[PDB]
Every structure is written in C-alpha cells, then in structure tokens.
Design a protein around this ligand. Structure first.
Ligand SMILES: [Ca+2]
Ligand SMILES: [Ca+2]
Lengths: 397, 397
C-alpha cells in the first residue's frame, strides 16, 4: 500500500503513525498543503477514478503526480473573515485551532506587541486573551458580536462568571459589538473600528469561527454538507471508500441532537486519527460522533461543559430548562421537559480538576441519552452532580 | 398514609424526608432499632398480613403495636466477627459504615488510646488507620488476612502503592495474617495474637466485612438471598409490595456482572432513599443496581475505582487482563478478552480530584457495557483514559 495524507494537523501524523505501526511494509507520503514528508507542497487536484493526486512544490514550481491506494484528507479549516475593509493588513492573524494558538503565542516576545484586539469570544478567543495578557502583559480586548462571550458553549448566566474572570484581570470585554473596519498605517493594522468605538490595535486575532477548508474535496466530487464539511461514515470514510477525512473539515453526528454536527475541537484529532490509521490497515474501527465536551482555563476560574446550552437547546426547538446548582462551584444542567432527557451540562469553578470530574461523569453519559433519573443516580465516586439531577426532577414536577 | 421506618442510617431519614416533601399530609414513625421519632426502641416482629410492627422501648420495657400502610427496612449490617476468644472484651469496636467510623473518631480524645489494631484492610479499615494516626497520633497497625490490603477494590500491584502510603506515614501493615485470639486485662482488650505475632492493643477495630442485619426480615418471611440480604426489585420493594428496603441490608444487581451483588457503600444510601421516598408517595422511581464506585484518601495519595479488579474478574471466571498506564498517576483497566468489555477501572494518584475525574468518566459508563473502543473514544474533557483504551486494544491484538 501507498497511502497519501494531505495536511499536517494533529490528524495526519496520527493517522499515518498508527497506520505504520500496523502495516510497516506500506509507504506513506504526507503533504503539508501549505514517511515521505513533502513540505511547502500543495495538492492541486484529486483524480478519484485514477487514484492520483497532482501536487506542486510552491517554491520551485516542480509538479508531481502521486499515486495512492488510500488517501487521507486532513484539510483543517479557515478563519471566518468579516467582509470589511482592512482584513488584508499585516498584523491581522487568523487562529483556527489550538496548535495555531500556541504558535502565535510563542512567536511573540517581550516588547513586540502593545495592543491586541481579539475578534471573537469563543474557546480560541478567550484562551488567546488570557495567554497574551498573562504570558506577555499585552493590553488585551475581546470584541464579540453575540450578546455574550462563549456563545453556544455556556449559558448567558454562566458566561458572566467567565466574563468577570477576564475583566478583573484587565481584559476588557465588549459584547453585542460589531467590527466595521480595520484601519492601518504601514499596510499594518493600527486600529479596529467597531459600531460603538475605535480601538487601537497593532495585533488583531481573528477567532470568530471557522469554515471547512474543503475546495479540494469539492473539486474532487466528494459529498459535502451545505456548510462545505466533508460527509463521512463512522469509519471516517468519505463518499469515496478509498478516501478518509477527519478533524475540522468533516461533519459527524451530534450524539445529543441526532443530527449532523461540526466539531472543530482539538481532542477529536487524535481519536479520529487513530481510527483512520486502523482502517487504512484494513481494520473496522469506528468513531460514532461527538457531544462537544470542552474545557477552558481562565485567570482564576475554569469553565467546562458538553452537549447543548439552554439557548442552544432552545434554538434547536427543545422545550428545555436550565437548572443551576451552587456549592465556589456552579453546575448548570440542560433538560428536555417532555422526555426528561439531559441535553447538556456546563459549569464554572476555581477548582479546575474538581469541575472536570463532574463534567466528565456526565459527558460520557450524554451519547446514551440519560434522563434526569440517570443523573440523580449517577454512580460518581451527596455529590453535586446527583444534586443537580434532584433539583431538575423537582423543577420538572 | 402511615409509614413506619425501621432503622436510622442515612437511608431511613432520607426516605422519610423525601416522602414528606411529596406527601405532607401523611404520618411517619421512625424507630432507631437500637416525624414521630422513637429512640432506644426495637421492632420485635413484623406482621405483614395485618400491617403491624410490635415495638419495645428497651429502657422502660413498654411494648407497642404500630400500624402501617407502608414499611421501610433500613436495618444496616453487622460486623463479621472471627470465631475466636476475647471478641467480647471492652475496646473491641465493630465499625460497619462511614458514619460509625466518624463516631468512633470523634469519641476519642487526646491521650485516651495508645495502641490501635485494625482488623481488616478494606475501605473502612484503611480510613480508620489514617484517621487514628493523623488526627490523634495513635500507634496504628492494620492486620489483613488476604495477601493484600483493599482486596476486591484494587489489584495486588496497585495495592502496594496504597500500602506504601500507609507504611511511610508510620502505619504498620501485616498481610497474609490471621487473628487467633484477643487477650485482655480488665475485661478490656490488651493484646491481639495473630498466627505470626503478638501485638499490644488497647483499641481493636473490627473492619473485616459485614453481614446484612436482617433477622427481622427473615422472621417476617421476606425473600432473602443465601447471604441473608433482602431481595428487592428496582423500585426498592421487597417480596412484600408494601415493604421497601435499602442500604447495607439488601442485594441489588451488579451492573457489570449481571448477577446479584452486595454494595454496603455510603453513597448508595442517599440515592436509594430518595427513590424509596418517591415510591412511598405512589411514584415509580427506579434504582437499577450498582457497579461499585469508591474512593479512599490516604496520607498523601488517593485511590479510586469502579467495577471489578482483575483478580475479582478472574474469580468470576472472566478471561480478564489488567492493563496499566502511568503519567504521578496510575490507571489500571480491566478488560474481558473475548468481548473486549471493560469490567473495571482503578487508580492511584497524589492528585485526588484529577484521578476522580478519570475514574468518574469511566464509572458512569460501566453499566452501559462499554468496550475498549468506547474507552479509546471516551469524550473526556491525549488524556490518560483514552491512552488506557489504546494500550488495552494493543494488548488484546
Ligand atoms: Ca493614518
Ligand atoms: Ca494478664
């Protein structure tokens, strides 16, 4: 077997290394899409019938046609960019994943950046806010279009706890605020203009969500969803059975809603890569989908969760209720009224590991469709998780 | 409704308080079996056809016949006592539950006890070892018949980690060692004689396991298992539909083995009590059984787990394998070879909450019969739990 892997994320290297452990006699070529590893190299087209990928080295222009028995698409995502003026200036930096986040953080050094504006108050935005202010003492402002930070990850009520953690450690936060244009001085960003103010920024981080980087799949004829996400089965196979895909370029079943979802989360990479590795070696490993577990560490508190927030469940049209419990630790449990199904759980605490233990207990249950009674009876090592289930059974009665 | 509750554990008060919240117009009488609360009072007999309990106040001898619509049996357990000489001396103290443990700990004061011997190195024994040595500086020795401490809760290999925590904080531990007799001075214990040595003890803690305290159920004609545990359905009803039972006097399904089990654990009380409360109020709440989640905090480390240990799984006749992973944190994962089912998980760490988070993730999964792939893919907030699943899939291949 020759296997070609396009993209170096976490997912590509993982799939290939797992592949090789199982089939050491096979050959793998990895292309970085900027173990035979071709850097600064782009796949230009995929010919599925012929099992060929045309590639081009971007420096020398030398073009080559690789042949494959199996292909892996680890194409990642691209930053959503507001259709506004100045989104082309130097200093405007997309960050679509945690690896990219770490790169930007370690490419900065003392005295380089004076003002940072983060566009987007999601997982990426908030982690960057904290890193820039804490590692480097950079003056940092988060600007979020939605009326809350972490929209879709925590409720509005819970988000305020996270908001305070940021504001009390000198991160300014603006919500319900739209970016109107970026203004520049050397062809380098110098100001962000919102619909409410003007902010000075010599660094602007784009962390406002992502789209699958799937033009190559599209051109090849692969089945894609309306969002452009590559559609895969549970073996991580695309509509072409010799082509696998994973990571932030695919859609997989949301295990709470039973509908197709999109999970561009770090954690998915390694797990899906392993399955792709095994299946490239003729195995039949499966990855069922996701419920969306997450954690963010802030200055003093930590926030964590899985599944739907109340607003998220309401947006899907569940008759949902948000039940909260406090101990500092807060849990919020999201429950469907008519079925009594638990749809999600989120929390905030100054004790990171203690909260994680509570969220994990429930997160691994969500795919099995637990009800409030399952949370009342959850056999956790009374505990706040059980108390949340009792309060929810009480709220529903 | 009049409901009579026999026993004040956690379970009795919980059942009654939940009952009352739902049906405030009803009456409850609670008997302590040494809200109308009769202390120093014993139930002598139950007449099921007549729905009556004859009781006797143990001080005055006054006898009374209570009538009931529903009865709750919270009879607890009794310490297993070796059929050896001197098990009647003052200073020989059975401890069958964590509440009893806390009682003994707070009844001692500075300079009262010089030497403590703990007979049994299980959950109770070890917690008492630690409390006595740490709160009070008592010279403490654990004597265990099995070749390891925590038999049935951790593997032999993992138990050594817990053993060391004890020995390095001055608790002496003897395993593979049998109690032959207790020797006394004032009709008070002064020495424990084992088959290997003589130990001075002015306090001897019996923590060598328990039997259900069910004579009253037996006399009443209630269906009991070979061990004497009251058999209940998932609504916590005995063979008499007007009589409920829970706590350490019942058997419920082991959710890993699919067979009847016995779970005299603190945690079960509150959860089962709530269900009994609701069902006394004409609800139809259920409690499915247990997998046996547990945690013990020692001097510096913590140990935690759920389900079967490898030796436990082997004793049940599973072709089981124990897979370990280290990071200090150790996890051990117990796997059935032919089905790939995970049967259990245990661990040890100096980080208490961090381990708990890992054990919880898997503990709430055990009843759903996860396989190694479910652990490889567990959607925990790569993580050591996933790594354990990958190593186990590797060991099995
Ligand atoms: Ca200018
Ligand atoms: Ca003598």
């Amino acid at each position: 077997k020759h296997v070609v892997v396009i993209g170096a994320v976490a997912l590509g290297p993982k799939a290939a290394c797992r592949f090789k452990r199982l089939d050491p006699e096979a050959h793998v070529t990895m292309i970085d899409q900027a173990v035979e590893a071709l850097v600064e190299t782009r796949a230009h087209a995929i010919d599925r019938a012929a099992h060929t990928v045309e590639i081009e080295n971007l420096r020398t222009g030398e073009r080559r046609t690789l042949k494959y028995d199996k292909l892996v698409l680890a194409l990642g995502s691209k930053a959503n960019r507001p259709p506004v003026e100045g989104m082309d200036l130097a200093g405007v930096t997309p960050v679509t994943n945690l690896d990219e986040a770490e790169f930007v953080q370690h490419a900065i050094s003392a005295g380089e950046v004076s003002k940072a504006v983060i566009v987007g108050g999601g997982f990426i935005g908030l982690e960057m806010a904290v890193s820039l202010a804490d590692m480097w003492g950079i003056d940092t402002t988060v600007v979020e279009l939605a009326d809350q930070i972490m929209p879709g990850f925590t409720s509005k009520s819970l988000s305020q706890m996270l908001r305070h953690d940021l504001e009390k450690n000198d991160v300014v936060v603006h919500t319900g605020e739209k970016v109107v244009r970026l203004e520049g001085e050397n062809g380098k960003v110098a100001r962000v203009i919102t619909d409410k103010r003007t902010l000075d920024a010599d660094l602007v981080i784009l962390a406002a969500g992502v789209s699958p980087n799937t033009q190559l799949a599209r051109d090849a004829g692969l089945e894609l969803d309306p969002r452009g996400a590559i559609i895969v089965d549970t073996r991580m196979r695309t509509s072409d059975p010799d082509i696998f895909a994973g990571g932030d370029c695919v859609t997989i079943p949301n295990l709470v809603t039973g509908k197709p979802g999109f999970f561009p989360l770090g954690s998915m990479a390694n797990r899906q890569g392993r399955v792709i590795g095994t299946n490239l070696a003729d195995g039949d490993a499966t990855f069922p989908g996701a419920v969306g577990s997450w954690a963010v560490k802030l200055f003093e508190g930590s926030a964590s969760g899985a599944g739907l927030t109340v607003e998220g469940a309401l947006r899907e049209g569940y008759d949902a209720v948000n039940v909260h419990v406090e101990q500092i630790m807060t849990l919020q449990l999201v429950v469907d009224r008519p079925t009594r199904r638990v749809l999600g759980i989120q929390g905030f605490s100054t004790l990171g590991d203690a909260l994680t233990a509570r969220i994990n207990a429930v997160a691994t249950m969500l795919a099995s469709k637990p009800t409030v009674e399952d949370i009342s009876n959850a056999e956790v090592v009374m505990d706040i998780v059980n108390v949340a289930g009792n309060v929810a059974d009480n709220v529903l009665a």
